Ligand binder design. Structure first.
Ligand SMILES: *[C@@H]1O[C@H](CO[C@@H]2O[C@@H](C)[C@@H](O)[C@@H](O)[C@@H]2O)[C@@H](O[C@@H]2O[C@H](CO)[C@@H](O[C@@H]3O[C@H](CO[C@H]4O[C@H](CO)[C@@H](O)[C@H](O)[C@@H]4O)[C@@H](O)[C@H](O[C@H]4O[C@H](CO)[C@@H](O)[C@H](O)[C@@H]4O)[C@@H]3O)[C@H](O)[C@H]2NC(C)=O)[C@H](O)[C@H]1NC(C)=O
Ligand SMILES: CCCCCCCC/C=C\CCCCCCCC(=O)OC[C@H](COP(=O)(O)OCC[N+](C)(C)C)OC(=O)CCCCCCC/C=C\CCCCCCCC
Ligand SMILES: CCCCCCCC/C=C\CCCCCCCC(=O)OC[C@H](COP(=O)(O)OCC[N+](C)(C)C)OC(=O)CCCCCCC/C=C\CCCCCCCC
Ligand SMILES: CCCCCCCC/C=C\CCCCCCCC(=O)OC[C@H](COP(=O)(O)OCC[N+](C)(C)C)OC(=O)CCCCCCC/C=C\CCCCCCCC
Ligand SMILES: CCCCCCCC/C=C\CCCCCCCC(=O)OC[C@H](COP(=O)(O)OCC[N+](C)(C)C)OC(=O)CCCCCCC/C=C\CCCCCCCC
Ligand SMILES: CCCCCCCC/C=C\CCCCCCCC(=O)OC[C@H](COP(=O)(O)OCC[N+](C)(C)C)OC(=O)CCCCCCC/C=C\CCCCCCCC
Ligand SMILES: CCCCCCCC/C=C\CCCCCCCC(=O)OC[C@H](COP(=O)(O)OCC[N+](C)(C)C)OC(=O)CCCCCCC/C=C\CCCCCCCC
Ligand SMILES: CCCCCCCC/C=C\CCCCCCCC(=O)OC[C@H](COP(=O)(O)OCC[N+](C)(C)C)OC(=O)CCCCCCC/C=C\CCCCCCCC
Ligand SMILES: CCCCCCCC/C=C\CCCCCCCC(=O)OC[C@H](COP(=O)(O)OCC[N+](C)(C)C)OC(=O)CCCCCCC/C=C\CCCCCCCC
Ligand SMILES: *[C@@H]1O[C@H](CO)[C@@H](O[C@@H]2O[C@H](CO)[C@@H](O)[C@H](O)[C@H]2NC(C)=O)[C@H](O)[C@H]1NC(C)=O
Ligand SMILES: *[C@@H]1O[C@H](CO)[C@@H](O[C@@H]2O[C@H](CO)[C@@H](O)[C@H](O)[C@H]2NC(C)=O)[C@H](O)[C@H]1NC(C)=O
Ligand SMILES: CC(C)CCC[C@@H](C)[C@H]1CC[C@H]2[C@@H]3CC=C4C[C@@H](O)CC[C@]4(C)[C@H]3CC[C@]12C
Ligand SMILES: CC(C)CCC[C@@H](C)[C@H]1CC[C@H]2[C@@H]3CC=C4C[C@@H](O)CC[C@]4(C)[C@H]3CC[C@]12C
Ligand code: NA
Lengths: 244, 49, 294, 40, 294, 40
């Protein structure tokens, strides 16, 4: 439920701020049914944190499976950071090719037209229609890769609901395999010849792959300090506000 | 219960971007098409499987 | 249910929480989103510091250059009736919009428009891409050079009596030097005559072998009377270093056009650093569908 | 930087794709190793 | 030079810069140091969240326990004249400071001092190291138990007529259970008699073989009359969980002490989780130099 | 946690020193390798 935000926010900005389209349909589908599945199917193999045979039976009317405390995390805090990282990589790709952030607001009408073969950028160059479309597609590819990068820290902060990573431990071999495969698939979809023809995903330059790293570390640190006050402070604000 | 929750935020975000698409200028065909896109976009294909 | 979860009067709750909870949550999200905004802004400022103002870091997506045209035809079709005047208005409005930038009133004084050779010439380098010698100077391009398509004599530009014009233009690229083909034994048929090294040739033809006969006399107008672009207007130094810069233009009159029939005309530029693409139908060449139905 | 500055408009995407594939492959292998390490 | 670099009146400079520079630099350092302070404070708050309030994370540097004493002797020497009263004042003030904490007035009511066996007994576990059952309860230790060194009869405690006392004390350690040596054939000579499993024995002697003769009768006073510490006062739960806790004490009277001669007396505790160190002369044992010069 | 909780006051400094020395040694070697790599 965390990756839904960095998947819907781009269209909301496409209609509101009038910027070119950041994320494509063929990228959302490749994430939802590809990358996300293996790491999430692996989360099931996780061991206990405390003695489960000690607590009383759950209540059916009050304790649920999906409560608002979860929505506040996935839709409210982690997914938001994921969206910021995706938009960051986006603006970087468009700024390095000639389209600065000040000139992107208000361009969709001419950025989409199929018959305007002269679109001036921030430096005065004239871009044909297919040329600007290739850049938009390369932005979809890097946005999808940014999503994978942030899913790393999301799978790690989702491994433990309360306990710390330095306590439980990374003894789950399936989760490790999920991260490795999740990265190999993204690299394969971008670098294989004939992918920019079949699926419309162009190769990335090596400096772009590092635009989502800081957001991922931040997600890890935020959730780590989150899962700390809950331990030291039982019954406080952090508990009745963020404990799934 | 989970399905209920999900469908709630999807129809809330759609009704909100419809009123917004009317305060900015878009025609009714675009505002209606936008609503349908936002709702369907809030559905997770693999969580049930 | 319906009523209680909305407002109960014992715990003084609205929607589920009390007065102090909505405040704790609102304050938390205000601080959280504020930090998020500040971080995004800082990471965007370092980006403004990374790039240069006089040159795009990557110039591989725009090469070779395209070939655009006025008028603005949708689906690459120019269809209009010689009787109904409200048929070619959308075209003339565009043609006029393009030529309206070459008015002599705009090009006046020593700066930043200097007088250049009335006959095609070689390149001109105004230094490097720096701010040392201020705003560079660009060559002047007069309207009158285009003979029968200038909007100065026949405002309509030809659409009035079944003789249309098409002003072709080469896409502006920073630091791009046009290189024409040499006089060696290998050269297209057309290009042999009037080889002026300093001119980049543009030549239109028919897409299909049949249409050849149905297309009449393609009369090109340009600098010096040649069917090309003079190399002296290059290279382009970019907006920041060369504001008030005019790119050459080439007029094409499709005289003697068969009536009531769709004609597919493909125009193509030739040169070394010019390459076409089977996917982009505007890279180096362009297609136009003309049908003067009357 | 002169007429023959043609390099300013070229990028070796071929070599980049070759390396990116070598890397993807290695990561895939390592993954398999970790997955099957213990069932032998 | 001397005058100009101090104040010139053309550029309106003081010490070298103008008015606006000192402000730019002062503002920069204020913001910089402010960020530095905020970062250091945040990294210290996460540290306050890491550790526990009822238990030190590392307890390897304090084991086994030491053996301190009152009085407070500098260089481990107790030298005083039996005539001049202003000679043993610094000692009595300390002895008194230590015993002043065992006043009966302080130990009153059911909490948190419960009455314990008047004779040595076994350990007592008041649960785990949690806050569930509130403040734990500690056993009462009466002053009078120490017979001739209590400051209740002879305030001076003995220093008045050439018979001093030494109140020995075992260093308080959280969760430390004292373990005495068992009755097996291997045990020191001294310890054989009066083996009360529940008592940790303390026995003093002479450092050198010669001094033996010059040392008189070592008379130990303690709980039950034994020369040790009762196991019932353990373990210690820490200040937070056991405020108002009293540790056992053992009085030692060095009767029949030779006059005008420095005597080296070494006291030593015995037990399983007790180990001495050749570097720390206070780990388990202690040394005292006594010289009653009169 | 009971009388025989003696482990709560012990630390294996020996093993720690052994490992810390193995590591220091490795780092020293690697350094030499980098330094002389090129003069052969
Ligand atoms: C670039 O130059 C353009 C042309 O400049 C003219 O020719 C050059 C060589 C010089 O001699 C120069 O001095 C000339 O002006 C210039 O555009 C021109 O702008 C004027 C001023 O608005 C226009 O005149 C007005 O024309 C209309 C009717 O226009 C008919 O024809 C045009 C095509 O030419 C069609 O597009 C229209 O739909 C019409 O069919 C008149 O109604 C209008 O009346 C006004 O003036 C009269 C007095 O004369 C008053 O009584 C009225 O109340 C009105 O105020 C004007 O006479 C002229 O049409 C227009 N030319 C073209 C081809 O559109 C352009 O602005 C210059 N641009 C720059 C950036 O310098
Ligand atoms: C271009 C811009 C991009 C925009 C992107 C938007 C992305 C959207 C992100 C998130 C969507 C949020 C939508 C709301 C989600 C609410 C979750 C919810 O409805 O979950 C259902 C819970 C049920 O939970 P349960 O089963 O445990 O109950 C058990 C009860 N038992 C046991 C007592 C019976 O019901 C409840 O929580 C009660 C319902 C509470 C509803 C609160 C509504 C608040 C919504 C908006 C507020 C905005 C105000 C802004 C102004 C602030 C002031 C400055
Ligand atoms: C600027 C860049 C920002 C990037 C942000 C995203 C980062 C997310 C990716 C990686 C985060 C790594 C976090 C490291 C955590 C280490 C924790 C650890 O070490 O805690 C030690 C545990 C505890 O042990 P214990 O005391 O319980 O044992 C008891 C044994 N008894 C029972 C026998 C006594 O020990 C154990 O877990 C057992 C040993 C497990 C060893 C795990 C080693 C593998 C670690 C990471 C794999 C790499 C993933 C890379 C993904 C990229 C793909 C391209
Ligand atoms: C762990 C459990 C995992 C479970 C997941 C199930 C695994 C699924 C495995 C395989 C399904 C993938 C099917 C992909 C089909 C791509 C079809 C394609 O590329 O056809 C190309 C067409 C050609 O068109 P044309 O003839 O007009 O060209 C004329 C060009 N001229 C004229 C210029 C020469 O182009 C087009 O249709 C253009 C439109 C492109 C449409 C792309 C649709 C792809 C949708 C989802 C992809 C998700 C798969 C991700 C892989 C996951 C691996 C685990
Ligand atoms: C615990 C979890 C362990 C996980 C381990 C996963 C294994 C990682 C596997 C492979 C990573 C190494 C990749 C090396 C590839 C170099 C290839 C190369 O030749 O690449 C050159 C590019 C420069 O490209 P250009 O655009 O300038 O030229 C383009 C010029 N044209 C296009 C015209 C040709 O450079 C590049 O791609 C730069 C490549 C990225 C640099 C690696 C950075 C490593 C980051 C953090 C590691 C720090 C470890 C610290 C150790 C602590 C020990 C306690
Ligand atoms: C690119 C993405 C960047 C993202 C960076 C995000 C950084 C922002 C992180 C935190 C800022 C939010 C701070 C909000 C403080 C005001 C909240 C407040 O008003 O709270 C009131 C309560 C005190 O009320 P009570 O509980 O006594 O009353 C009991 C009442 N009843 C019964 C309801 C429980 O406050 C409490 O409990 C104390 C709880 C305070 C919350 C601690 C959360 C700390 C989380 C993260 C900080 C770590 C940042 C690491 C970043 C590294 C960057 C490289
Ligand atoms: C238990 C132990 C397990 C161990 C398993 C080990 C598995 C093997 C490991 C690695 C194999 C590495 C293979 C490297 C392939 C290099 C292919 C390559 O360098 O091709 C480059 C050229 C295309 O260049 P271009 O001129 O068109 O560039 C565009 C130029 N412009 C656009 C400017 C005009 O190729 C061509 O022409 C022809 C390309 C023919 C198709 C090659 C297929 C390669 C695709 C995927 C294979 C990799 C899978 C690795 C595992 C992934 C798991 C998910
Ligand atoms: C580019 C520059 C390259 C520079 C490379 C330099 C080479 C580095 C050489 C060696 C480093 C590895 C050291 C591993 C030693 C493990 C030994 C071990 O058994 O240690 C256990 C301790 C846990 O101690 P305790 O107190 O819990 O138990 C005490 C229990 N008693 C005392 C009772 C016994 O654990 C520990 O010391 C934890 C040891 C530290 C964990 C390593 C963290 C690595 C950090 C960043 C690297 C990330 C790379 C990501 C890859 C990107 C690829 C592109
Ligand atoms: C071109 C290629 C170049 C290649 C060069 C390779 C060089 C060789 C590489 C590595 C050699 C590794 C040697 C490992 C030595 C292990 C020694 C060790 O584990 O000893 C531990 C014990 C002491 O334990 P304890 O019970 O007292 O602990 C205290 C217990 N409490 C305090 C609680 C009572 O040792 C003892 O008893 C006896 C100790 C006897 C003295 C051993 C000397 C070791 C010191 C330095 C040698 C390392 C230099 C490496 C390079 C550095 C370059 C600057
Ligand atoms: C323009 O095209 C016309 C045909 O539409 C050419 O004139 C024709 O010439 C043939 C002889 O070859 C005569 O039989 C026809 O009667 C002519 N028709 C007309 C309408 O004149 C004409 O030669 C062409 N002119 C140019 C310059 O290409
Ligand atoms: C205390 O020490 C004194 C010696 O200072 C002991 O008394 C001496 O005993 C010897 C016989 O062994 C006599 O010759 C001396 O005259 C005695 N001297 C004095 C001052 O009495 C005495 O026995 C010791 N008492 C104890 C309890 O140890
Ligand atoms: C850790 C968090 C809370 C720090 C967030 C720092 C914020 C407040 C900082 C980070 C980068 C900063 C920006 C950096 C550059 C500029 C350009 C200048 O012409 C106006 C101020 C402006 C726009 C700054 C405003 C304050 C800013 C956004
Ligand atoms: C990147 C920089 C500028 C961020 C610096 C953040 C500073 C202002 C933050 C970081 C950690 C914060 C402290 C965290 C915990 C506490 C304890 C609380 O009982 C009083 C506030 C106090 C003392 C906070 C004051 C503000 C603080 C010091
Ligand atoms: Na989803």
């Amino acid at each position: 439920l965390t990756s839904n935000i960095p998947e819907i926010t781009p269209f909301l900005v496409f209609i509101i701020g009038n910027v070119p389209l950041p994320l494509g349909t063929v990228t959302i589908l490749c994430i939802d049914l590809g990358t996300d599945m293996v790491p999430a199917i692996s989360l099931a193999y996780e061991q206990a944190e405390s003695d489960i045979m000690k607590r009383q039976p759950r209540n059916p009317k009050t304790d649920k499976l999906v409560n608002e405390r979860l929505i506040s995390m996935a839709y409210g805090q982690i997914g938001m950071i994921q969206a910021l990282g995706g938009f960051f990589s986006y603006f970087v790709i468009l700024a390095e090719n000639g389209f600065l952030p000040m000139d992107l607001i208000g361009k969709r009408v001419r950025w989409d037209d199929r018959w305007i073969s002269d679109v001036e950028d921030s430096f005065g160059q004239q871009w044909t229609y297919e040329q600007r479309k290739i850049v938009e597609f390369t932005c979809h590819t890097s946005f999808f890769i940014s999503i994978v990068v942030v899913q790393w820290a999301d799978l790690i902060i989702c491994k433990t609901r309360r306990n710390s990573i330095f306590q439980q431990g990374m003894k789950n071999k399936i989760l490790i395999f999920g991260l490795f495969e999740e990265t190999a698939l993204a690299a394969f979809l971008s670098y294989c010849p004939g992918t920019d023809v079949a699926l419309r995903m162009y190769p990335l330059k090596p400096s772009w792959w590092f635009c989502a790293f800081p957001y991922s570390l931040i997600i890890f640190l935020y959730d780590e300090m989150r899962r700390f006050i809950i331990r030291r402070s039982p019954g406080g604000w952090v508990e009745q506000e963020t404990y799934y | 219960h989970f399905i209920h929750i999900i469908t709630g935020v999807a129809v809330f975000l759609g009704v909100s971007f419809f009123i917004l698409s009317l305060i900015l200028g878009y025609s009714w065909l675009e505002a209606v098409i936008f609503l349908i896109g936002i709702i369907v976009a809030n559905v997770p294909e693999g969580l049930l499987a | 249910g319906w009523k209680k979860f909305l407002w109960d009067s014992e715990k003084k709750e609205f929607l589920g929480r009390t007065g102090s909870s909505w405040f704790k949550i609102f304050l938390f999200y205000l601080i959280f989103y504020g930090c998020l905004a500040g971080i995004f802004i800082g990471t965007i400022q370092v980006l403004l510091l990374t790039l240069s103002d006089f040159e795009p870091k990557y110039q591989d997506r725009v090469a070779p250059p395209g070939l655009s045209h006025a008028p603005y035809a949708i689906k690459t079709e120019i269809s209009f009736s010689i009787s109904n005047p409200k048929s070619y208005e959308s075209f003339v409005k565009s043609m006029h919009k393009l030529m309206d930038l070459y008015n002599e009133s705009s090009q006046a004084g020593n700066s930043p428009f200097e007088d250049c050779s009335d006959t095609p010439a070689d390149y001109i380098k105004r230094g490097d891409l720096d701010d040392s010698q201020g705003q560079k100077k660009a060559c002047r391009f007069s309207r009158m050079w285009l003979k029968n398509c200038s909007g100065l004599d026949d405002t309509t530009y030809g659409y009035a009596e079944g003789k249309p014009c098409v002003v072709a233009k080469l896409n502006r690229i920073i630091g791009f030097y046009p290189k024409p083909l040499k006089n060696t034994t290998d050269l297209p048929e057309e290009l042999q005559a009037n080889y002026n090294q300093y001119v980049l040739p543009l030549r239109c033809a028919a897409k299909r072998e049949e249409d050849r006969e149905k297309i009449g006399s393609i009369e090109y107008f340009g600098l010096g009377g040649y069917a090309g672009f003079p190399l002296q207007y290059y290279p382009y130094y970019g907006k920041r270093l060369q504001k008030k810069y005019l790119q050459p233009l080439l007029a094409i009159q499709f005289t003697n056009l068969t009536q009531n029939m769709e004609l597919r005309i493909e125009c193509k530029v030739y040169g070394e650093n010019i390459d076409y693409s089977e996917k982009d139908r505007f890279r180096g060449r362009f297609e136009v569908k003309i049908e003067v139905k009357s | 930087e002169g007429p023959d500055n043609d390099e300013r408009f070229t990028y070796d995407y071929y070599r980049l794709r070759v390396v990116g594939l070598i890397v993807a492959a290695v990561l895939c292998v390592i993954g398999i190793i970790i997955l099957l390490a213990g069932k032998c």
